Structures are given as structure tokens and as C-alpha cells.
Write a protein that binds this ligand. Structure first.
Ligand SMILES: Nc1nc2ccccc2[nH]1
Length: 155
């Protein structure tokens, strides 16, 4: 059915990944990658690049598509169609703003308990350079009712 396009960008380097603690809005209190809605007349990749700069202060060269995840919240008519990207070549330094507080995390210290619960399923694939298609059904913001997750050759 009808789905709204979102982007999600993980700045993932060999020994660390950047996450930002979302200060306000839906899902505040959790460490997120950077992203959001795509604009009219904007390609998905261009929106991910824009949202990364807007939210982290970072400029990136190459963006690699690594996943597509569809989220359903029970009772909510709009599905979230989230296009996940990764990058390791960035320019700039992340900046705390009144919307997000950024921190680098060692790969063995990902704060899964303070992240969206679906991250525990697909972040491991992201970390092993796998690509994936995912679907997660939520009841509220805390409980996964069911899900599917499949490794793919083409996102
Ligand atoms: N990983 C992740 N980021 C999300 C943002 C909104 C709803 C569900 C989500 N799962």
C-alpha cells in the first residue's frame, strides 16, 4: 500500500560508526542514523545526502545503498519505506544541535539497548557489508510483533 519515503544514513568507518541521539520528536531518546523525508522533485540519494548534511554537518562523496526496510505501526495508515545508505568518506565534524547529539561508537559497543529494536536484527548485516530487504511490524515504539529480513544482492 501507500508508503512514505525516508532515508537513513550510517557513517560507518572500519573501527567506528556515528550515531546521533534524537532530542525531540518521534522516537526521541534513541540513537539514530541521519535521515528523514525525501522532497518533491528530489531523488532518494540526493535526499539522503541533504539530510546527512542538514542533521550531522557532514558532507559525503560516495553513498552506497545497503538496505530497504518497510515499517508498519499498527493503527497507523502510512507505511515507512526506509532506504538505508552507508558511507565511509565524509568531510567535516559532527555538531551537537538542539535536535541531535552526535557520538562515535566503537563497533563492539553499539548501544542497542538505546536504539530502535529493529536495529538488533539488521545492524549486524550492515556491519558485515551485507545488503538487505526488511519488514518490521511494530505495536507502539517498543514491541516488534513480526518481521521479515532477507539478505539481497541488489537493494
Ligand atoms: N531503525 C529505525 N529507525 C526508525 C524510525 C522510525 C520508525 C522506526 C524506525 N526503525
Amino acid at each position: 500500500g501507500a508508503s512514505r519515503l525516508y532515508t537513513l544514513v550510517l557513517v560507518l568507518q572500519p573501527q567506528r560508526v556515528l550515531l546521533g541521539m534524537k532530542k525531540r520528536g518521534f522516537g526521541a531518546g534513541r540513537w539514530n542514523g541521519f535521515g528523514g523525508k525525501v522532497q518533491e522533485g528530489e531523488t532518494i540519494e540526493d535526499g539522503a545526502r541533504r539530510e546527512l548534511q542538514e542533521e550531522s554537518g557532514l558532507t559525503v562523496d560516495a553513498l552506497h545503498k545497503v538496505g530497504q526496510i518497510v515499517f508498519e505501526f499498527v493503527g497507523e495508515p502510512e507505511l515507512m519505506d526506509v532506504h538505508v545508505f552507508c558511507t565511509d568518506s565524509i568531510q567535516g565534524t559532527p555538531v551537537e544541535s538542539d535536535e541531535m547529539r552526535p557520538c562515535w561508537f566503537q563497533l563492539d559497543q553499539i548501544p542497542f539497548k538505546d536504539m530502535w529494536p529493529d536495529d538488533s536484527y539488521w545492524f549486524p548485516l550492515l556491519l558485515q557489508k551485507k545488503k538487505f530487504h526488511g519488514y518490521f511490524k511494530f505495536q507502539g515504539q517498543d514491541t516488534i510483533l513480526d518481521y521479515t529480513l532477507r539478505e539481497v544482492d541488489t537493494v
